[PDB]
Design a protein around this ligand. Structure first.
Ligand code: HEM
Length: 153
């Protein structure tokens, strides 16, 4: 359970992300695909992209980065009370997209790296720890729905 102070650190940096949702979404997905190429293979939509420059040039990738970060921002702003938001996302990711929980750990690492690069003054160690706690809570609650559905592993 995050404390109020931890949530304030999370949402303070997140309000900065929202100034350029699309640039953040591109940077996070590109870092994910470069750091963990098995993730790119899950996207029929993107798996034709073979270089970082091709990834940066893809408008469709930039659009999907916005989709992803808008869903995550709506979850963070619930401060843990996010059951209604996670149901459909766990269901699609487990049963349609076939995304292991581990790959959610990988995207969490990419989010934290990009927030540290773009917002160092608002993303000191206290805020890095709080965001890590918020993304761990996200993964914990998604993993429980995966397990219900027979996909935790
Ligand atoms: C912060 C974590 C993530 C969030 C908030 C998120 C959010 C979303 C949203 C909102 C959609 C569109 C609606 C839906 O299908 O449920 C989507 C689609 C999708 N996501 Fe995620 N996602 C996350 C992580 C991942 C990861 C790690 C992968 C793969 C490694 C992944 C793979 C996909 C795929 C394959 C689609 C369908 C893309 C298409 O063909 O249109 N997601 N995601």
């Amino acid at each position: 359970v995050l404390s109020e102070g931890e949530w304030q650190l999370v949402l303070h940096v997140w309000a900065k992300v929202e100034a350029d949702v699309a640039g953040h979404g591109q940077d996070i997905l590109i870092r994910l695909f470069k750091s963990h190429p098995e993730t790119l293979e899950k996207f029929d939509r993107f798996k034709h992209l073979k270089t970082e420059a091709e990834m940066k040039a893809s408008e469709d990738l930039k659009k999907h980065g916005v989709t992803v970060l808008t869903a995550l921002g709506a979850i963070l702003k619930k401060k843990g009370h996010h059951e209604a938001e996670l149901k459909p996302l766990a269901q699609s990711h487990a049963t349609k997209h076939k995304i292991p929980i581990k790959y959610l750990e990988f995207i969490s690492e990419a989010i934290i790296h990009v927030l540290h690069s773009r917002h160092p003054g608002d993303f000191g160690a206290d805020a890095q720890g709080a965001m890590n706690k918020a993304l761990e809570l996200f993964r914990k609650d998604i993993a429980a729905k995966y397990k219900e559905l027979g996909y935790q592993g």
